[model samples]
Target: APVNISKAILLGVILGGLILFGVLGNILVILSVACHRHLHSVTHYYIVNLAVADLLLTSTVLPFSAIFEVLGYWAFGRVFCNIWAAVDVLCCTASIMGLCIISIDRYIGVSYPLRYPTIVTQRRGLMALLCVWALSLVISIGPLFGWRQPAPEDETICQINEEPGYVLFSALGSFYLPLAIILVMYCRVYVVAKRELLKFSREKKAAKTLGIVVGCFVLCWLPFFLVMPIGSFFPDFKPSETVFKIVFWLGYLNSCINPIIYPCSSQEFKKAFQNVL
Candidate 1:
């Protein structure tokens, strides 16, 4: 059980620090958006939900996996393992859904400034998140409803549904479809931003923001998704355990980075964050 205890200590120190910052950062974001009256708007509403998702990802999901990675095995019992994986899927899906929502929000704001008035409202934004997480629940709970592989005799490892069918199913629902939406919507922003603005000022700014959004998205999650499918489909191309741990943590980094991207990019968010201090 104490295999490589020294390595475990190193990883625990690093990941524990990361988990600490991620929790604190997302909490700051939610509080900033909630208490700051001037920040109340459709955009900030979506931003708050994004923070909620990251907060859940940081607390409910990331800590368990951090322990798993430190030990290189599942210490939690079976029922909790299933619950952890389900909530992991739920929060990760919701987090990306948040990204997609923000991307779409910006696109409409830019493309339909005059039309933006009544299309997406504050209450409606909250409703939109309700729908996002609800459907995310639909995807996440499928494993618990008899779609999952049975627990194996090798009891140390807690895996996601290992049945080949569920392997691709979860990845498709969790990452690929949402990724397609963001990529398409962000590309539209690229071409439309320049064409609509007529000057480089807004266009240049839009493109930089676009890079932060899509660039961070691709960098964090794409490798994990790619490795999942390839590892599943090609028996010969077996990825090592360390590969899984690295890419999975890399994906979790997206949740960690979320607070930074929005606040750093938005003057209003920083003003509020500073106000909180």
Candidate 2:
């Protein structure tokens, strides 16, 4: 799988851009939320938590992936192989879980506005954040405990153990379940928010932002999601390297897209970014 010089340079440039943009954008998100007192709410707290996950992916996972993609080998050794895969799964799972949490937060806010302040308090939000991270940690570290051990023969290529059981477990927990919850919750939010749109300016803004958030989530992850299930079910259906790279990076771009989408959708977040800048 050694890439030619031209292809290596091309991939390096593309991944370098993603690393720079993803890191900077997610950093801005964390800083804006942390520094702005006005943005210090349960929702914003979850946003910051999401940024942390994205930041972890961009900083720790993407760089290694970029290098492995260009060099066509896992130069980091077996210990790092396990560590890297675990971290990759952890951050990605946390990121998606964060989105689900946000959708639930908005659902409560839009559907039960009167109870939002009482129920979705900072304490509750912190507890949810802990659960998100805890669940992510469990899924990611399972490989280390024999859930899906990496192939000893192919240590050169760093990748998750794509065994059917591991694939189903990771895909269901990380993508399918969260995606289902997000869609259902957002659908409810959409219906209620639309009904209340004319009645409350707040509901209007919530609905608009929710649409962008969920839309971006699906757009970024759908291709990768499809790839995973198909690869799991059809062992001989190997995708070309280029096709695999494209879909994989498209999903990785989700971490980068979140910061961009949030500021674009929410005026408060935009203002916070402006103030930070």
Candidate 3:
């Protein structure tokens, strides 16, 4: 697809803003949580994990994906493509899996407040985080060994080809399964929080907080998955030069939506942002 100059400029401006804000906001998130001792709770620990994962997603994956768009073809070569693909897999899978765990955390906190502290201890939270990363690492890095093979014609394009069953299993394990877990767990959390809120209206804050998180998760990841499944069908169905650029930028936009939505929607994070200033 030949690039269109005007379309490129418009999308570039949008993506540039997204990258700047997303990176800065996520950095502030990490710093705010780290600087405030009072903010350190098991719940906030998971949030910080979420922030860290978002940082990785924005910093590592989005940048490379954008580069692929700008360059039109993978100019980074074979080895770099493998590494880039690995990072993409690692960061995205970890973020999604972390969301699943965070939903379960919210559910536990709401349904069993007394036992929540013991069940979701800081140490355990950290361990769960480590496990999420480790699992993502296994799925992402395992491909580099033999689970996947690079395209023969284009070394820059990497994919799962060693085994179709493994490929499907990897996709299911990383995306479908985690999405199901998040949906199921968050549904329960919502019900539990609603029931508990009747006794203590203050629980609304916590419920609303988790709702924003889940909403952002859906917004950020949904488009990528939706577009991905259509990619196979549109192998040669290139839109007009202008339309193609718009779709490209929309994907990049998802990477940055979290930082803005989180602070805007969460009172805790809003205060945290102000305290940073």
Candidate 4:
């Protein structure tokens, strides 16, 4: 399959821009939170973890994906393919799980203010984050060692184009379940915040912030999951180059969206943004 010149240019631009912004924005968040002593709370700690996850996702996954998109296929070979796939799965999973943790943290902070510190202490948050990354790494890389095989030479793809059960399990386990947890936790956070605020206008703002975070998470990933299952059913539905470009870039866009939503939507993060910007 020949590379489409226009498609290549378009993808290069989009991926490049997204990777750049994702890195810069997440770095800003990290620096801002780290530099400001006032921002060193349980909530900001998790936000920092979230930012770090996004940064790693962008840096590790986006560039390799861009190269794969433009160059046609796995020029990199099996060993590197395994490594890249592992990184891709682990980073994306960790980020998703991190969002779940963040949602729980927000729910606690808003729903139970006084005991929030005890429930989500800085030490406990670190342990939770450590466990998330460890679990993600195990689940993601574990399949590669046994249950899955690398894409074939003729296949030209470096991803797990595997059995339907396997693919569905991977997607649901990594993305969908984490998303569901986040959505439910945030819903609880919204209810708690609304009750606490009463007639205050700030309730709406809080809800909107959570809404943006969850909304972007859904928007950025939904299309890829929707399209990926089709490939499982029709193994040969092998998307047209156009469809490939679209799904690939849609996932890439995720790297950029989170940073914007985090600072713009969350008041605590907005203060961190001020310190950074």
C-alpha lDDT of residue 116 in model 2: 71
TM-score of each: 0.90, 0.91, 0.83, 0.85
lDDT of 1 at 28: 92
Candidate 2, residue 49: Cα displacement in angstroms equals 0.7
Model 1, span 30-111: residue lDDT tens? 8998888876777667778878888999998888888887787887688888788888888888878877777787677666
Sort by TM-score, best first: 2, 1, 4, 3
After superposition, candidate 3 runs with Cα above 4 Å error: 1-7, 143-145, 153-167, 197-204, 226-252
Q: Please give the ranking of all candidate structures by lDDT, highest first, separated by commas.
A: 2, 1, 4, 3
Worst 10 residues of 1 by lDDT: 197-206
Q: Per-residue lDDT tens digits of candidate 2, residues 97-162?
A: 888888888888877666678888988889988988888788667744657654586557656666
Model 2's alpha-carbon lDDT is 0.81
Model 2 TM-score is 0.91
Give candidate 4 regions above 4 Å deviation: 1-7, 150-157, 197-211, 233-241
Worst-scoring 10-residue span by lDDT in model 2: 195-204
Model 1 lDDT, residue 85, Cα: 82
Per-residue lDDT for 240 in model 3?
Answer: 59
Task: Report the C-alpha lDDT of model 3 over 1-277, residue by residue, as the tens digit.
Answer: 6588677877556666678788888788878889988777766777777778778878887777776666567777777777777877777787777778878777777777665678878788888888888888887677556566546677545443435445555566777788888889878877876565242333346556766866766665665455444443464653455654565455445546666765777777788889997
- Candidate 4 per-residue lDDT, tens place, 1-277, comes to 8788876898678778878988899898789888989768765676677788888878887788778867867777677777787888787787788778877776766766655567877688888888888888787777556567545666356566567866777787788888888889888877766666332343345446656776787788887787787787787776786886677677767766778886767777778788677
Runs in model 1 with CA error above 4 Å? 143-146, 153-155, 197-211
- Badly placed stretches (over 4 Å) of model 2 are 150-155, 197-200
Residues forming the 10-long window of minimal summed lDDT in candidate 4: 197-206
